[PDB]
């Protein structure tokens, strides 16, 4: 009678940790959600084959609305696993599900896996220099989210980097590209006119982290807004004040304009 929250990792089925695999293999029932993120290098079939268990995929409503009606009942008499892309508690509200587990009298354990939040280290930007993070959400009809723009502003004033998770509407197979993110930000700049995000802003794009050849690119918005970064998922990063060593990596590894090597001191 235990519930395991198990992360599947960044890109493919092998991004799960050995610990995660061995526990999932011995579970009686296995549930999963594939709406919080996109694992571009695998399929449900491959994941199922790897763990040797049939997987019951749940929708966002199944989880947010009926997690205690669909998953917890079985977890009271058996070992149940709930799998998720990346790390199960990063950039999701799944932590709250552990509260539901407890009140249901069910023990829960968490098995971590590589997460985009941590994988940003491959951009060469010091991970401790990141400040508040935000999500660039798709506008729904006339509703136009803009809060993420203020996050960039606040971090940049402190000289901190801003990690921008990008939207995903899995049910519609809609995966926001870094390009779409940039467009939205420029539009928001037009409204707020804070000088936060412009054609000259230096940005970093990380696409398909977890794969062997992720797309790592740095440059000015004017130049990257129309560049092809490959298949989703993508994340966008607006660096704050760079250290020379960060700029060197972006130039040498992410093909950034050598001019950034000359920071303004």
Ligand X SMILES: Nc1ncnc2c1ncn2[C@@H]1O[C@H](CSCC[C@H](N)C(=O)O)[C@@H](O)[C@H]1O
Which residues sit at the interface with ligand X, rule CB under 6 A? 10-11, 36-37, 85-87, 90-92, 115-117, 165-166, 168, 206-210, 233-235
Residue 151's CB is within 10 A of a number of other CB atoms, namely 19
The residue whose Cβ lies closest to ligand X is 86
- Taking CB under 8 A as the rule, does residue 95 contact its own copies? yes
The CA-to-CA distance between both ends of the chain, in Å, stands at 59
Size of the site for Na ion (CB under 5 A): 1
Q: What is the CA radius of gyration of the chain?
A: 20
For residues 98 and 107, give the distance between their C-alpha atoms in angstroms, rounded to a whole number: 9
- Taking CB under 5 A as the rule, does residue 130 contact Na ion? yes
Size of the site for its own copies (CB under 8 A): 63
* Residue 140, helix vs strand vs coil: strand
Residues with Cβ within 8 Å of 9's Cβ and at least 6 positions away in sequence, in order, are 15, 16, 17, 39, 85, 86, 113, 114, 210
- Closest separation between CB of residue 238 and its own copies, Å? 15
Segment lying near its own copies (by CB under 8 A), choices 67-75, 86-94, 179-187, 192-200: 86-94
CB nearer its own copies, residue 45 or residue 121 = 121
Backbone conformation region of residue 133, classed left if phi is above 0, alpha if psi is from -120 to 50, else beta: beta
- Taking CB under 8 A as the rule, does residue 117 contact its own copies? yes
Binding its own copies (rule: CB under 8 A), the pick from 59, 76, 104, 135 is: 135
CB nearer ligand X, residue 27 or residue 163 = 163
Specify the pairing of strand 234-238 against strand 202-207: antiparallel
CB nearer ligand X, residue 170 or residue 261 = 170
For residues 43 and 141, give the distance between their C-alpha atoms in angstroms, rounded to a whole number: 31
Segment lying near its own copies (by CB under 8 A), choices 28-36, 91-99, 189-197, 218-226: 91-99
- Taking CB under 8 A as the rule, does residue 204 contact its own copies? no
Are 85 and 38 in contact by the 8 Å Cβ rule? The answer is yes
Beta-bridge mates of residue 217: 205
CB nearer its own copies, residue 56 or residue 132 = 132
Six token digits for residue 126: 């010091």
User: Is the dihedral angle over the CA atoms 171, 233, 88, 100 positive or is it negative?
Assistant: negative
Binding its own copies (rule: CB under 8 A), the pick from 37, 133, 177, 201 is: 133
Give the position of tokens 């991004």. Answer: 15
For residues 67 and 132, give the distance between their C-alpha atoms in angstroms, rounded to a whole number: 29
Q: Which residues bind its own copies (CB under 8 A)?
A: 7, 9-10, 12-19, 21-22, 50, 87-93, 95-96, 98-99, 102-103, 109-115, 117-119, 121-122, 124, 126-135, 154, 158, 160, 165, 209-210, 212-213, 245, 248-249, 252-253
Binding residues for S-adenosyl-L-methionine: 10, 87, 90, 115-116, 166, 209, 234
Q: Which residues bind Na ion (CB under 5 A)?
A: 130
Binding residues: 10, 87, 90, 115-116, 166, 209, 234
């Amino acid at each position: 009678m235990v519930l395991y929250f198990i992360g599947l990792g960044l890109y493919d089925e092998r991004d799960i940790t050995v610990k995660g695999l061995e526990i999932a293999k011995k579970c009686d029932y296995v549930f999963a959600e594939f709406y919080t993120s996109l694992m571009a290098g695998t399929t449900l079939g491959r994941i199922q084959k790897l763990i040797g268990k049939e997987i019951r995929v749940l929708s966002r409503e199944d989880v947010e609305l009926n997690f205690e009606n669909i998953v917890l009942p079985l977890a009271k008499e058996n070992d149940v696993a709930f799998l998720t892309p990346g790390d199960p508690l990063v950039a999701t509200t799944h932590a709250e599900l552990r509260i539901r587990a407890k009140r249901a009298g069910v023990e829960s354990y968490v098995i971590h896996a590589p997460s985009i939040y941590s994988a940003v280290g491959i951009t060469g930007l010091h991970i401790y220099k990141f400040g508040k993070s935000a999500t660039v959400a798709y506008p729904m009809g006339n509703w136009f989210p803009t809060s993420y723009y203020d996050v960039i502003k606040e971090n940049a004033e402190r000289g901190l980097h801003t990690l921008l998770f990008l939207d995903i509407k899995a049910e519609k197979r809609m995966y926001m590209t870094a390009n779409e993110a940039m467009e939205l930000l420029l539009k928001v700049e037009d409204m707020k006119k804070g000088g936060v995000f412009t054609d000259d802003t230096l940005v970093v794009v990380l696409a398909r982290a977890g794969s062997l050849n992720p797309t790592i690119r740095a440059g000015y918005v004017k130049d990257l807004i129309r560049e092809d970064f490959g298949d989703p998922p993508h994340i966008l990063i607006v660096p704050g004040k760079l250290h020379i060593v960060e700029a060197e990596y972006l130039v040498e590894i992410a093909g950034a304009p050598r001019e950034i090597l000359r920071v303004n001191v």
